[PDB]
Structure 1
Amino acid sequence: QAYVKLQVAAGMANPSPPVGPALGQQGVNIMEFCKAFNAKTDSIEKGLPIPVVITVYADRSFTFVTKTPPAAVLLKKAAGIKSGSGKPNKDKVGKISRAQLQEIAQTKAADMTGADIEAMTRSIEGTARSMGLVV
């Protein structure tokens, strides 16, 4: 009830321009959002949009979902890139490996709906080949 799957980068909290009222348009304001957003951003390593998923009941108290950041941006910090490459099969920018993707996706056991390791591996390699890093 009353949820969204959308977040901007967790290096900034109380993010009123990019998402903002996407989390606190309603009667719930953004003060517990920014406080506990920093409190959950301290857990997962930085440089990542660490997304929050809101629930609510008729008492204005709840416990959100603290999910892992996208593997898109885990590959971003893995390759040092933020704006990777426009038109991802024209210019050459790099190539990544299954072991490094295992090192990135070893901790996603409570976020991924996949009980296959090589599925996550070649799926994030396809993410890389859509990124610009043709494996």
Structure 2
Amino acid sequence: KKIQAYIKLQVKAGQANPSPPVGPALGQHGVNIMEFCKAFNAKTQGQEPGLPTPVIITVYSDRSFTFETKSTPAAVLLKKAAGITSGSARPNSQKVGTVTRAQLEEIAKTKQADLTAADLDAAVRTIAGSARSMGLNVEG
């Protein structure tokens, strides 16, 4: 039916109801936002709740929506790695003080190193490819 990944959905972990982080984002997809809250309730307390949580969703049509088990998000918690909230006005050339490799340790402890990587070191290398996002280099 609707079979391709990279479907963009950032609402709160445990609460699908706050829309203006994405708004009307899954109307043409087929399944409305208010039914996904049972799936965001299944993955709480580790995927950075409170802030709206991005997750690669796999849209089905049989009342089942699995979320890929990425424990710590590397789209929003790498804003926290440098120590800011609002990123730079251009990524990786405009800077507010870039993030180094010494501050990529607390996020990388709980990576679930098979369910998003092969070993744990490439999951540290995942956020070496995920901190290149928001006005931040990966330097050392």
Which structure has greater helix proportion? 1
Q: Provide the C-alpha distance between the structure 2 equivalents of 1:124 and 1:131, rounded to a whole number of angstroms.
A: 12
1:14, CA displacement in angstroms?
2.8
Taking the TM superposition and a 5 Å limit, the aligned residue runs for 1:1-135 are 2-3=2-3, 4-5=5-6, 6-10=8-12, 13-16=16-19, 18=22, 20-22=24-26, 25-26=29-30, 28-37=31-40, 39-40=41-42, 42-44=44-46, 45-46=48-49, 47=51, 49-51=53-55, 53-57=57-61, 60-68=62-70, 70-87=73-90, 88-98=92-102, 100-109=103-112, 110-117=114-121, 119-134=122-137, 135=139
Structure 1 residues 32-52: Cα deviation after superposition (integer angstroms, max 9, x where no partner): 213442x14533232352425
Which of these two proteins has the greater Rg computed from alpha carbons?
1
Q: Provide the C-alpha distance between the structure 2 equivalents of 1:53 and 1:14, rounded to a whole number of angstroms.
A: 16
Structure 1 residues 58-83: Cα deviation after superposition (integer angstroms, max 9, x where no partner): xx332422543541312112333232
Contact 1:14 1:31 in 2 (8 A): yes
Q: Which amino acid aligns with 1:133?
A: L
Tell me the SS of whatever aligns to 1:124. Answer: coil
Q: Which amino acid aligns with 1:7?
A: L
Given the two structures, how large is their TM-score scaled by the length of structure 2? 0.62
Task: Give the paired residue count.
Answer: 129
CA RMSD of aligned residues (A): 3.4
Name structure 1 gaps, 5 residues minimum. Answer: none
Contact 1:2 1:56 in 2 (8 A): yes
Contact 2:58 2:66 in 1 (8 A): yes
Contact 2:9 2:55 in 1 (8 A): yes
